[PDB]
Every structure is written in structure tokens, then in C-alpha cells.
Amino acid sequence: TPTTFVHLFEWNWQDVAQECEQYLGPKGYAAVQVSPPNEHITGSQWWTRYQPVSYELQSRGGNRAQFIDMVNRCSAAGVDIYVDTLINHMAAGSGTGTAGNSFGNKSFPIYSPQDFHESCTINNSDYGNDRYRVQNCELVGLADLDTASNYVQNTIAAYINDLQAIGVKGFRFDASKHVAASDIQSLMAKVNGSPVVFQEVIDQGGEAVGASEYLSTGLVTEFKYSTELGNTFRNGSLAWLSNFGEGWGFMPSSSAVVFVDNHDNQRGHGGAGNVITFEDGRLYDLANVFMLAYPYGYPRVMSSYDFHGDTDAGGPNVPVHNNGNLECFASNWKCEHRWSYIAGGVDFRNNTADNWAVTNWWDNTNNQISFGRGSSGHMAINKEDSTLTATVQTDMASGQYCNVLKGELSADAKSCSGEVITVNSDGTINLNIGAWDAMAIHKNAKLN
């Protein structure tokens, strides 16, 4: 069952289509979040994608034709597409868009100065004591659209509805905190059907605007998950995760979009250094294994590129699928969604979707944990400097299982590609996990 989606950060339409047919679809990924496909300002910086000029499908990722082809191809492979939608603003300054359109002085092909909120700057302290300035003033100088305007609403809605007609099944509302929740409601009233919608709202607490205000318009990004998970894995005890989720003050599980990191906090935006990224290697594997195994929220695996200490830089100069050569894992695209442990985690979540409970939780009071998903699957993570050899209780049928984190079951289910885990007649497992390693098994990866 589909349970996880991925963000192919800066991946062009051609790369996404191939990635859907060759890996994402076969591995069970539910969807792919693409970078803004609408016309935006010129420049190699990744953030240019967040400064719109018009809603024409002409961007760094490709043209409209290529965009459509990507939607059809992914759909055919069983993978949905979520479009990152800029519902809060338009580009700053002036210039020409990726489609040739000119803009300046808050004048755009589809917007005039009157369709924007009077200019003012959002100041740090505004987040804490001034709701008005947060949703009416400019975010980093970006022209703040008057989202209360019926015209603006119709324009953004027509954009979303048109994308749905093409086949887009979901949308990410960018900078949703900077847009009044009631404004988003009026917007959703103009949206056809009921597509998947998740709103980006960074709320670590103590904000004038709270994430909970957006629970009626769609899913909401739970940034506490990324920060708290990273802080615990780096500086705390995994044993504290026994009640992760609402127990830590997070939003309801059925409303949250979670992740280990995102393109923003992996480079200092909305997240401190405690956030875990691909740069932390095995630490990243483990955090992902936890997130994917734990039954909280709708997880989005991050897929990035090595920006070489340059937080402004755009992606690699070569595509992912470059003439038969996969530009992954090196100094270009990281392709974390292909990392054995991460992809294995997705397989686990997909096969435990029939039991969203945490059963038989065990820990060594510190950095060793194990828990299951009823009789559907079991897992364990060892982050101590000594081997984890504890015997844990599980609800799984006795037999031999593939550690889906290190391999997979064969076609004839007669063998595994990775290590084998045994469940004794009493349903217990005699763990043997080295330092900084883990294991995960499920009912659909049992040896025949």
C-alpha cells in the first residue's frame, strides 16, 4: 500500500518520468513532489523557483509538453505528482521570466500592483506578536499577493484546477503561514474535487500564527518532527521516542506531513544544525528507518544534491539519467530515496499499513530500541557503541524473514539478498545488530 512520497529537488521533468518508471513505481513510492513548474525568474540559484512571474508551465524543469509527459508517465507507473504551489507571492524586483514574460514594479502578466498587499517588511519579531504583518507584509521582499481578493483567488484556483485536469493529484501550498487560513479556505472553495493538499507551516511554538489553524484546509507540514527527531538522534536518547508524535505536542498524525529534512532546513532555513541530512550518512539512514517504521504522519523522503557549501547554488549541471549513467550517490545528485536503508524503510511502511499501532516497545533506556506493527512487522535500531543482542518480543509468525533494510525477498520467496532474521516459536527475536545499524521485517518478506 502506498504510504510515502518523495521530493525530487530540482529534478527536471525528464529525470522524474524515468525515475518513476524505473525505481519509484517499482519500489512502491506513492508520489513525487516536483519543484515549482510555473514560470519564474532567471538565474541558477535554487530559490529562483520560488519567485513566480506567471503560471505558464515553462521553467527550469522543462516546458509544458515535457511536464505533461512526466505526469502521464509517472501515473502509468502508479506514481502521483504533487506540484509545489506559490499561493503567497510573486517575484521581487524586475526582469524576464523563464517563459519570456517581463515584470517589474509589482506588474506581472497576470497581476497588477493593486492585486498585491501594500508593501511592508516582515520582521523577525512579527512572527511572535504580529499576525497581521506576517500575512500581509513581504517575505524576503517578495510581492505579497492579496489572497483575500476574489481575482487572486480565481487566478490561483484556475491554476490548480488546470493542473488537476492535466493529471496532477496533489498540491503543496508554499508559505501557507503567510496566508490567512480563512483566505486558503475561500481558495479551496474554488478548487475542483478534493486533491491531496498539504500546507507548509513552520511552527516550533510561540508563534502568533499556529499550524493548527490550517487543519481544516488540508494536511500541514509538522516541522517539529524534523527538528525533534534530529535533536533526539544527535543529542538525546532514542528511548524518548516511545511516545513520539502528539505526545510531544505534535499535530494529529492524520494531518501531518513529516520528514527528516527538506531543502530549506538542510541549508539553514527553518532548521538548526541538529537537523539530520544526507551529509550525516549512517545517522541519516537510522533516522529515516525510524520515521518510515513509526506510524506517525505522511512521510516525505528528501532527495537532494551536494551543494558544496553553497546554500544558494542550484542543482548539478548533469541530469540524473545521463546517457545510461546514473549520476547518483556521488558529488551531484544524492538520490537518498534509493539508499538501501531508506528504500527498505518505505517497503516496511507499505507492508505494515494495515496496523498503525506501535506494539511491544523495548529500549535499553538509551540508544537501543525495538517495536513492531502488530503481526505485520517488527524493527530495531542500535545506536550504542556495543552490539544489541537483547531478545525482544514480537507478534509475528515464527520463521525466517529478510532484513528489508539490507536486502529483499526473491521472486520465488525462496531466498533473501540481505541478512536473514529469525522469529522463534514463541514469537521472539534474538537480535544481533552492530553499532549504528538496524533491522526491519514484515509479513510480506518471509521466506517460504
Which of Cl ion, Ca ion, none lies near 368, with the C-beta cut-off 5 to 8 A by kind?
none
Cβ proximity of 106 and 113 under 8 Å? yes
Residue 179 CB contacts under 8 Å (≥ 6 apart), including other chains: 87, 88, 135, 147, 173
Unique residue bearing C-alpha cell 533494510: 405
Least distance (Å) between residue 101 CB and Ca ion? 22
The footprint of Cl ion on this chain (CB under 5 A) covers a number of residues equal to 3
Q: Name the closest residue to Ca ion (Cβ).
A: 178
Q: Which stretch binds Ca ion (CB under 5 A): 131-139, 276-284, 316-324, 402-410?
A: 131-139
Among 126, 174, 285, 336, the active-site one is 174
Which of Cl ion, Ca ion, none lies near 343, with the C-beta cut-off 5 to 8 A by kind?
none
Cβ proximity of 39 and 66 under 8 Å? no
Is residue 73 at the binding interface for Ca ion, with CB under 5 A as the rule? no
The closest alpha carbon to 295, from 347, 340, 352, 251, belongs to 352
Which of Ca ion, Cl ion, none lies near 262, with the C-beta cut-off 5 to 8 A by kind?
Cl ion
Distance between CA 318 and CA 20 in Å, rounded? 19
Least distance (Å) between residue 134 CB and Ca ion? 8
Cβ proximity of 307 and 267 under 8 Å? yes
Distance between CA 313 and CA 322 in Å, rounded? 21
Distance between CA 329 and CA 325 in Å, rounded? 12
Least distance (Å) between residue 183 CB and Ca ion? 8
Task: Tell me if residue 308 falls in helix, strand or coil.
Answer: coil
Q: Name which of 7 and 106 has its Cβ closer to Cl ion.
A: 7
The footprint of Ca ion on this chain (CB under 5 A) covers a number of residues equal to 5
Is residue 133 at the binding interface for Ca ion, with CB under 5 A as the rule? no
Q: Restricting to residues 186-205, which ones interact with Cl ion according to CB under 5 A? A: 200
Residue 367 CB contacts under 8 Å (≥ 6 apart), including other chains: 237, 238, 239, 382, 383, 384
Q: Name which of 90 and 229 has its Cβ closer to Ca ion.
A: 90
Residue 115 annotated to the active site:
no
Question: Could you tell me the CA-to-CA distances from 378 to 81, 308, 332, 395, 418 in Å, in that order?
Answer: 30, 38, 35, 8, 16
Grid cell at residue 314: 542550484
Which residue from 19, 138, 144, 228 is in contact with Ca ion, where contact means CB under 5 A? 144
Is residue 262 at the binding interface for Cl ion, with CB under 5 A as the rule? yes
Is residue 222 at the binding interface for Ca ion, with CB under 5 A as the rule? no
Residue 200 annotated to the active site:
yes
Is residue 226 at the binding interface for Cl ion, with CB under 5 A as the rule? no
Q: Name which of 81 and 431 has its Cβ closer to Cl ion.
A: 81
Q: Name which of 21 and 130 has its Cβ closer to Cl ion.
A: 21
Among 200, 213, 222, 285, the active-site one is 200
Residues 123-138 as b/e (b if ≥16 CB within 10 A, e otherwise) read eeebbeebbebbbbbb
Where on the chain is the footprint of Ca ion (CB under 5 A)? 88, 135, 144, 178-179
Give the active site residues: 174, 200
Where on the chain is the footprint of Cl ion (CB under 5 A)? 200, 221, 262
